[PDB]
Ligand binder design. Sequence first.
Ligand SMILES: *[C@@H]1O[C@H](CO)[C@@H](O)[C@H](O)[C@H]1NC(C)=O
Ligand SMILES: *[C@@H]1O[C@H](CO)[C@@H](O)[C@H](O)[C@H]1NC(C)=O
Lengths: 48, 48
Amino acid sequence: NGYVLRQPNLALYKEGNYYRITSRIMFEPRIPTIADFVQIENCNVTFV
Amino acid sequence: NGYVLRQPNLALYKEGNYYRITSRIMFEPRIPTIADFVQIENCNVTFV
Ligand SMILES: *[C@@H]1O[C@H](CO)[C@@H](O)[C@H](O)[C@H]1NC(C)=O
Ligand SMILES: *[C@@H]1O[C@H](CO)[C@@H](O)[C@H](O)[C@H]1NC(C)=O
């Protein structure tokens, strides 16, 4: 299983050791959580 | 409690033994999860 985001306007990034997901239009950062993801069986290697 | 979807553009269906929820505008299928539902007390019999 590979996970993706529920809507496009967000984007992950590696801020430091931890990972932070920000908006695409502003630099405001938001905490990661499990509710923000969605499941798809086929894994693409190109992801984290 | 009866559950419904967080936004209208989705739709459940019984693909096989398991249930799959797809987009209303494309046939792309997405995995079921609990985060995609919402609770309402009154149960309508007309649902699954
Ligand atoms: C999936 O990974 C392949 C690896 O070669 C990459 O070329 C492709 O762009 C990726 N597709 C995506 C991320 O949708
Ligand atoms: C609720 O179920 C009743 C069962 O008679 C049905 O007639 C009605 O259309 C349903 N309402 C919904 C699904 O909003």
